[PDB]
Amino acid sequence: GRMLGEMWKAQLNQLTRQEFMEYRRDGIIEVDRSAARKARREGNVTGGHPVSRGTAKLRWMVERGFVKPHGKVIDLGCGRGGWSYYCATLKLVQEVKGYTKGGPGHEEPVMMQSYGWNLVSLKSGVDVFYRPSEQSDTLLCDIGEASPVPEIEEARTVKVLQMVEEWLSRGVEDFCVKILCPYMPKVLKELEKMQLRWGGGLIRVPLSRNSNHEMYWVSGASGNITNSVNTVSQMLINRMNRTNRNGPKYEEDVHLGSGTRA
């Protein structure tokens, strides 16, 4: 038998494009980024606007205690830097190192002056899958590229977990790791072993789009992995089958201020 999430992916792939676009943001929470997009086009780096939607997703988890960034934070796949700049605003964070691939088709780090920007060092041109691990107090990873083929998303997710395993073995106190495809067998098998060793649990951020099944493995959660994943699959399938669509529920984006930290 298959996990319900496999069903969801098959049904997702059968939507027309118009159906898909009507579904992907139906009933999710979305922060309004109109001012942020104007800020990046105007080079406004002091207005507190996050560089991406990712900031609001990590804020959601941090304010619920699912991860408590502190000390030295390493941000794997930092992209423009939304997670890294957010952590540098936090009282217990002392240093943020972000690594991302960059180059054609990939986001380059953006230089911002949000609060605590001077604690952030972002490095492009870095393939984290071949980078030696380093010590960290907080380990973040937001990597996982979508595909219509669930076996490709499965393999991509397993590769992330095998990399994270090396970084966690350095001794990490807090973590938050994107699980792109949590319902496929090879991901479940690996995650269950890694939960046994390192703890944590899977959570679904309601800012995630209905067009993906992404969940985050976070140190400040617990709970059965199979049940957590199934709960998300049923929600996403329920939303796909309720065809009176409303678009997202809008909320306010994070304000990251400006200024250096001592």
Ligand X SMILES: Nc1ncnc2c1ncn2[C@@H]1O[C@H](CSCC[C@H](N)C(=O)O)[C@@H](O)[C@H]1O
Ligand Y SMILES: C[C@@]1(F)[C@H](O)[C@@H](COP(=O)(O)OP(=O)(O)OP(=O)(O)O)O[C@H]1n1cnc2c(=O)[nH]c(N)nc21
Greatest CA separation for the chain: 56
By beta-carbon proximity to ligand X, the closer residue of 3 and 82 is: 82
Residues 117-136 that bind ligand X (CB under 6 A): 126-129
By beta-carbon proximity to ligand X, the closer residue of 5 and 79 is: 79
CB of 224 to ligand Y, least distance (A): 25
Instruction: Say which amino acid occupies 125.
Output: G
Q: By CB under 6 A, is residue 80 in contact with ligand X?
A: yes
192: tokens are: 């269950």
Between helices 225-241 and 185-198, what is the axis angle to 10°?
Answer: 140
Residue with tokens 């691939």: 101
Which partner from the list ligand X, ligand Y, none does 15 bind, CB cut-off 5 to 8 Å by kind? ligand Y
Q: 134-173 mask for ligand Y (x: CB under 6 A)?
A: ------------xxx-------------------------
Q: By CB under 6 A, is residue 113 in contact with ligand X?
A: no
The DSSP 8-state label assigned to residue 128 in this structure reads G
Q: Residue 139: name the closest of 59, 190, 78, 186 by CA.
A: 78
By beta-carbon proximity to ligand Y, the closer residue of 15 and 45 is: 15
Q: Which residues contact 223 (CB under 8 A, 6 or more apart)?
A: 201, 202
Residues forming the site for ligand Y (CB under 6 A): 12-13, 15, 17, 20, 146-148, 209, 211-212
